Design a protein around this ligand. Sequence first.
Ligand SMILES: *[C@@H]1O[C@H](CO)[C@@H](O[C@@H]2O[C@H](CO)[C@@H](O[C@@H]3O[C@H](CO)[C@@H](O)[C@H](O)[C@@H]3O)[C@H](O)[C@H]2NC(C)=O)[C@H](O)[C@H]1NC(C)=O
Ligand SMILES: *[C@@H]1O[C@H](CO)[C@@H](O[C@@H]2O[C@H](CO)[C@@H](O[C@@H]3O[C@H](CO)[C@@H](O)[C@H](O)[C@@H]3O)[C@H](O)[C@H]2NC(C)=O)[C@H](O)[C@H]1NC(C)=O
Lengths: 104, 108, 110, 46
Amino acid sequence: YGYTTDDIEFYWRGDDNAVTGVTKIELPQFSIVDYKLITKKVVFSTGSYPRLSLSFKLKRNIGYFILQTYMPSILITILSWVSFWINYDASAARVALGITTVLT
Amino acid sequence: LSQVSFWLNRESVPARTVFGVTTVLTMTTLSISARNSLPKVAYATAMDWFIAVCYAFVFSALIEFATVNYFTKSQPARAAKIDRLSRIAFPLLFGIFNLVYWATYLNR
Amino acid sequence: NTTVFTRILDRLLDGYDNRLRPGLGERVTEVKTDIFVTSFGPVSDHDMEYTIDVFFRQSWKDERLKFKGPMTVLRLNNLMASKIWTPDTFFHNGKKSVAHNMTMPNKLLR
Amino acid sequence: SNMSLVKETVDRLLKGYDIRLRPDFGGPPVAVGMNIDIASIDMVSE
Ligand SMILES: *[C@@H]1O[C@H](CO)[C@@H](O[C@@H]2O[C@H](CO)[C@@H](O[C@@H]3O[C@H](CO)[C@@H](O)[C@H](O)[C@@H]3O)[C@H](O)[C@H]2NC(C)=O)[C@H](O)[C@H]1NC(C)=O
Ligand SMILES: *[C@@H]1O[C@H](CO)[C@@H](O[C@@H]2O[C@H](CO)[C@@H](O[C@@H]3O[C@H](CO)[C@@H](O)[C@H](O)[C@@H]3O)[C@H](O)[C@H]2NC(C)=O)[C@H](O)[C@H]1NC(C)=O
C-alpha cells in the first residue's frame, strides 16, 4: 500500500514452489485446473507499486446439474410427448398433459 | 399410487392419464424437494438412486397404460394379457428392489 | 543512515499538538480531496444502498511539519498518521463503512 | 546463562529501533519474498 516500487520489491520465493497445497484442494463443485503466479508493477496516481498475482482456473463439474436441472426438464418433455399416442378424441387427457407440462 | 392405476377400468382413459401425469409431476417435485436438502456434490447418493428407481417404476406404469391404450380396439386380448401381467410383475420387482436396497445400504 | 531520520522525526513531533488544526488562528485549513474508485460494488436494490471501494486521498498544508534533510518526501508508515492532525472527513450518507486492516492498516502518509 | 544471553541480545536489538522507518530508509528498496500455503478454498459463491 504505502511503499512505491522504489521502496520495496515483491517476488515469489522459489517462483514455482511458492504456492503449495493447490493439488490437495478438494472443492465440492469446481475443480482446480491450473494456477499461475505473476509479478507486475501497477501505476496509480500516487506512484508505481509492485504487485503479485495468484490466479486459479476453476472448471465447474456438470454432474450435479445433469442430476438436478437437465434431467427433470428432459423427462418432462418426454412426458409431454405422450400426448401423441392418445387418441385425438380425448380432449381432457391431452390438455391435462400439455398444461401440466407447461406449468412445470 | 401409480400402481393402483392398473386396476382401474380399462375404458376410463381420462382417469388413468391423470394418474400417470400426476404421479410423474409429484415424483419430479419430490425429486427436487428431497434434492434441496444436500449440498452440491458431484456424485449420486443413495437417496438419489432410490428416487431414480421410483421415477423409473412410475414411468413404466405410465408407458404401460399408454401401451394398453394403443393396443386396445385392435388386439384387446394382448392388452388384457399385459395388464393382467403387469399387475403382478410390478409389485414383485419393487419388493425385491426395496429388499436389495435396504440390505446393501444398512450393512455398511 | 537512519539516526538522522529518527532525529528528524523526533524533531517534527517534539512540541506538536494533534488537537489543533494547522493554522488555528490566522488561516482556514484547505483540504484537497480526491477519490479513486477501485471497484463499484453491487447496488443492493432491496436496501436502497450501494457499496463502493475507494482510495480516499486527502492533502492539506501543515506548516508545523517542515524539515530539511537528505530526502525531499518522507514516505512514512501509517502509524505516524495517528500522532498528527488529520481531518475528520465523514460520509454524510454512509451506513456502515469499513477501513481495511489487512495485513496492516491500509493507510499512507507522505 | 543461555536464556539471559538471548534476552540481552533481544533487548539490545529492540533498543534504539525506529519502527516508522523501513530497512534502508534512504537507500535501495527492500526485497520481500512471498510464500503462500493455501489451506482451503471454502466457498465459491455466484
Ligand atoms: C487467469 O486470468 C489472469 C488475468 O488475465 C491471467 O493472467 C495473465 O497471464 C498471462 C500468462 O501468464 C500474462 O501474460 C504475460 O504478459 C506479460 C506482459 O509483459 C509478459 O511479460 C509475460 O511473458 C506473459 O506473456 C498476463 O499478463 C496475465 N494478465 C494479467 C492481467 O496479469 C491468467 O493467465 C489466467 N489463467 C490462470 C490459470 O490464472
Ligand atoms: C489494525 O491493525 C493494527 C496493526 O496490525 C492494530 O494495531 C495494534 O493494536 C493493538 C491493540 O489495539 C496494540 O497492542 C497494544 O499495545 C499496547 C502497547 O503499546 C498495550 O498497552 C495494549 O494493551 C495493546 O496490547 C498493538 O501495539 C497495535 N500494533 C500496531 C502495529 O499498531 C489494530 O489494533 C488493528 N485494529 C483492528 C480493529 O483490528
